[PDB]
């Protein structure tokens, strides 16, 4: 099955976080579904799950701040977390959950237990809890010898993480490297994405980078030229 999350990317303290998860290639009806999160310098926290009967159960450590739902009409799983605080900043993963039974003796004597395993998961979605507003990234071309030249885009001063970067969509798949971002003292983020190209194919060929800052949200393209 395939899962992709979507989000606010920026949530004010004391407001309600909200994330969604679309599912493909499996019917939502016949399974259990769950949410897990990871916060900076912490571990994976199990939020809670929904059953095929649409019943929900949750970690007490969330303190009933969490609520999890299904929308079969859109095949979408969903989650709200009310009253957020900086500690609720996290990447939020949606996953499938299977139930299995460990039985050590007699059923009737209740000598068995259940357990869940998450077998299919999403990539996560970055959600940040901050007062400040999304800031779009101004993006600058870094212009283009080994037989290759280097080509890049500077994606300056955005908030919060993350930022998507693409080149031409598919055709330039490699060799392109988008670097981890730098966190400025300002608290802004900047990253860079370069690709190595043939000099011969400079001046005949064209490259631009698709920069997405969904939290801004902002969108842009740069045509890189010497």
């Amino acid at each position: 099955v395939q899962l992709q999350e979507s989000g606010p990317g920026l949530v004010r303290p004391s407001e309600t976080l909200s994330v969604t998860c679309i599912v493909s290639g499996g019917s939502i009806s016949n399974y259990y579904w769950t949410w897990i999160r990871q916060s900076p310098g912490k571990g994976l926290e199990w939020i809670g799950y929904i059953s095929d009967r649409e019943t929900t159960t949750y970690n007490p450590s969330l303190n009933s701040r969490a609520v999890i739902s299904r929308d079969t009409s859109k095949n979408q799983l969903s989650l709200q977390l009310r009253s957020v605080t900086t500690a609720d900043t996290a990447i939020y993963f949606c996953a499938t959950a299977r139930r299995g039974q460990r039985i050590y003796g007699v059923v009737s004597f209740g000598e068995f237990f259940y357990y869940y395993y998450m077998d299919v998961w999403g990539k996560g979605t970055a959600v940040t809890v901050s007062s400040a507003s999304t800031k779009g990234p101004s993006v600058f071309p870094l212009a283009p010898s080994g037989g290759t030249a280097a080509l890049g885009c500077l994606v300056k001063d955005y908030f919060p993480e993350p930022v998507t970067v693409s080149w031409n969509s598919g055709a330039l798949t490699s060799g392109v490297h988008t670097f981890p971002a730098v966190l400025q003292s300002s608290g802004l983020y900047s990253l860079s994405s370069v690709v190595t190209v043939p000099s011969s194919s400079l001046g005949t060929q064209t490259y631009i980078c698709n920069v997405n800052h969904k939290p801004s949200n902002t969108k842009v393209d740069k045509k890189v030229e010497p």
């Binding site: 994976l44 993963f93 460990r102 600058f140 071309p141 300056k156």
Partner: protein, 210 residues
């Protein structure tokens, strides 16, 4: 939460569960690499999902006094990741906690020299009244690196923000250093340089207002 374990490349790594079961158990093992979806590796103590390499193995609950352990034979640089042991047993209750992560570091991969690309301020940024020099360092191993900046013959001590190195999708490190100048400063010096020293060797690149 993180418990480091370091292992020599190609040997057998053995990660113990953080919890010892009170009662007959069902343990799951999860692998999590930074920036990707976690993966179920073992379920029900010893069961491996299709597509998980038989290199991974768990301990069956035979009722012997044996702690849950993940065994990774022939550990590869690709097995560097976090490993959680989700422990279910009969006297502990519904276990909401995934537990802490054992962070696995695989050691003894070959030394790799850094590639270094140095970009001057865009003509755009200059007309946006800003200037930032960009130094990209990749393909190195190990991950400790010194980046230094120079304006002409003297070492710039500030305006410099450099990321902490981290492994990329070719298992080698990458880092970026940014030196932000004002246009009049850029046009002030004949030349700036970004100098990287890795494992004792220093190489350098240079740009100039043109």
């Amino acid at each position: 939460y993180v418990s480091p374990l370091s292992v020599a490349l190609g040997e057998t790594a053995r990660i113990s569960c953080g919890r010892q079961a009170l009662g007959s158990r069902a343990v799951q093992w999860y692998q999590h690499k930074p920036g990707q979806a976690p993966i179920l590796l073992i379920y029900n103590n010893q069961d491996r999902p299709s597509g998980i390499p038989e290199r991974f193995s768990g301990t069956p609950d035979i009722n012997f006094g044996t702690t849950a352990t993940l065994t990774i034979s022939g550990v590869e640089v690709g097995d560097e990741a976090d490993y959680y042991c989700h422990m279910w047993d009969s006297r502990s209750g519904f276990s909401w906690s995934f537990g802490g992560a054992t962070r696995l570091t695989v050691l003894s991969q070959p030394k790799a020299a850094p590639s270094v690309t140095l970009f001057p301020p865009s003509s755009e940024e200059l007309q946006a009244n800003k200037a930032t020099l960009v130094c990209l360092i990749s393909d190195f191993y190990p991950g400790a690196v010194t980046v230094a900046w120079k304006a002409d013959s003297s070492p710039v001590k500030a305006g410099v923000e450099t990321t902490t190195p981290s492994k990329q999708s070719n298992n080698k490190y990458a880092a970026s250093s940014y030196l932000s100048l004002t246009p009049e400063q850029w046009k002030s010096h004949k030349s700036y340089s970004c100098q990287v020293t890795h494992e004792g060797s220093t190489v350098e690149k240079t740009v100039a207002p043109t």
